[PDB]
């Protein structure tokens, strides 16, 4: 029957369960779960089965949000559709944990070393868990990372082609790793480049590499970090190597010049040391050559991060994803509707 009530939230309508009360918009609502007695977030996906792109994205997010459980990754609390049959099926509502803000607000703060390293520690724990689950985000950025007033942090979604709609409605290119831009493959640590850019932006309160397009992104990188060595050029493909090796050559500033001590809190024997550790970690993440860039595991062992290490958070068991669910299998719009409906019906 109809255990629902519809509410006008802007242009569209929100037909949710009566357990969720007082819907406030943030194309995603915030409500109070009277059963769980705590505020939640409600995302609405209208006709996700309409085409391949929307359908794949929604299918992965559902499957993955159900399987993955980590406290630094936003979790699924509930999922329902107000329609009662496959013929009438239309919308999907995904109830999630509610957070207070995204990093874009934290970046404008002058944080202390404890909060900075603790926020970063949580980022890496989440990233690591995703990796163990065979998920490389490939699209980290401050708008994808959300925080709470108790200084907790979570990763908001699963990234490229695994996300459907924006909760906390920041361009991707600013944080995209060069191996992608230069036509090279990618391994787990592309996400670590982004952490480097996000960490840097936190330090100096500015976008590290603000380019006009993807290509200009490469110009902003070598201007700051210096043209890479010839052993890296040999890994490029002919067309890319021809373009890269005809760029103006840049020496690149040291990470002391990129991130001086004035940017950090430095008024103590402990603070001036902590400033160098953050700079060291930055110099191990912001590395063009991904073969010389450290891993997520190594980032968690760094002196700047390891203070908070807890094996229950940084070494949690990986999830068991059902076999061959996230492949590039093409389907009809009706096949998608049935797969998605099967995952949403009560």
């Amino acid at each position: 029957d109809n255990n629902f009530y519809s509410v006008e939230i802007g242009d569209s309508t929100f037909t949710v369960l009566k357990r969720y009360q007082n819907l406030k918009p943030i194309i995603v609502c915030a409500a109070y779960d009277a059963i769980l007695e705590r505020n939640v977030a409600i995302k609405k996906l209208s006709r996700p089965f309409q085409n391949q792109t929307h359908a794949k994205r929604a299918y992965r997010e559902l499957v993955l949000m159900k399987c993955v459980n980590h406290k630094n990754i936003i979790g699924l609390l509930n999922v329902f559709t107000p329609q009662k049959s496959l013929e009438e099926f239309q919308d999907v509502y995904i109830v999630m944990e509610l957070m207070d803000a995204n990093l874009c607000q934290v970046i404008q703060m002058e944080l202390d070393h404890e909060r900075m390293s603790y926020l970063l520690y949580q980022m890496l724990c989440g990233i690591k868990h995703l990796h163990s689950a065979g998920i490389i985000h490939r699209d980290l950025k401050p708008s994808n990372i959300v925080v709470k007033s108790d200084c907790t942090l979570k990763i908001l979604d699963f990234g490229l082609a695994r996300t459907a709609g924006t909760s906390f409605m920041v361009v991707t290119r600013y944080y995209r790793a060069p191996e992608v831009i230069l036509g090279m493959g990618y391994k787990e640590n592309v996400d670590l480049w982004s952490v480097g850019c996000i960490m840097g932006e936190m330090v100096c309160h500015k976008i590290l590499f603000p380019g006009r397009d993807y290509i200009d992104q490469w110009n902003k990188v070598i201007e700051q970090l210096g043209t890479p060595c010839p052993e890296f050029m040999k890994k490029l493909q002919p067309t890319v190597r021809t373009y890269v090796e005809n760029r103006p050559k840049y020496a690149g500033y040291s990470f002391e010049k990129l991130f001086p001590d004035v940017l950090f809190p430095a008024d103590s024997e402990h603070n001036k040391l902590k400033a160098s550790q953050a700079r060291d970690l930055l110099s191990k993440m912001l590395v063009i050559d991904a073969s010389k860039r450290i891993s997520v595991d190594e980032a968690l062992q760094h002196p700047y991060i390891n203070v908070w290490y807890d094996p229950s958070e940084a070494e949690a068991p990986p999830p068991k994803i059902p076999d061959k669910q996230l492949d590039e299998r093409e389907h009809t719009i009706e096949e998608w509707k049935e797969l998605i409906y099967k995952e949403v019906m009560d």
């Binding site: 803000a101 607000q105 404890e114 203070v307």
Partner: peptide, 10 residues
């Protein structure tokens, strides 16, 4: 050292 328990947000 203790883990930060607060974060002044807007």
């Amino acid at each position: 050292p203790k883990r930060p328990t607060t974060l002044n947000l807007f």
